């Protein structure tokens, strides 16, 4: 395991899907909020029904 800052790991995962990595850093707070909101909805989704 080679340590790397998490924003730079996401930059190189965006760079893996044909999006130029500046699209992440110029939107980092918005992308973090979209992820944090989406993972929040999983707890309600799993809570709703077996």
């Amino acid at each position: 395991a080679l340590q790397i800052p998490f924003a730079m790991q996401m930059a190189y995962r965006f760079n893996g899907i044909g999006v130029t990595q500046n699209v992440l850093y110029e939107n980092q707070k918005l992308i973090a909020n979209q992820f944090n909101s989406a993972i929040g909805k999983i707890q309600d989704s799993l809570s709703s029904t077996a």
Partner: protein, 57 residues
């Protein structure tokens, strides 16, 4: 452009990300997008211009 910025504490370089090979940071190694405000955790240093030797022609 492709690779990662890294420093030996004193100088800034870019390298390919799977084998340490330092390159001097230049406008062909890199691309611009917008201004220093929006990027969290940006740093300063110089970016060298490969045309500069013939700017001094």
């Amino acid at each position: 452009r492709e690779g990662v910025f890294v420093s030996n504490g004193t100088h800034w370089f870019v390298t390919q990300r799977n084998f340490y090979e330092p390159q001097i940071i230049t406008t062909d190694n890199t691309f611009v997008s917008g201004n220093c405000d929006v990027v969290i955790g940006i740093v300063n240093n110089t970016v060298y211009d490969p045309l500069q030797p013939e700017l001094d022609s």
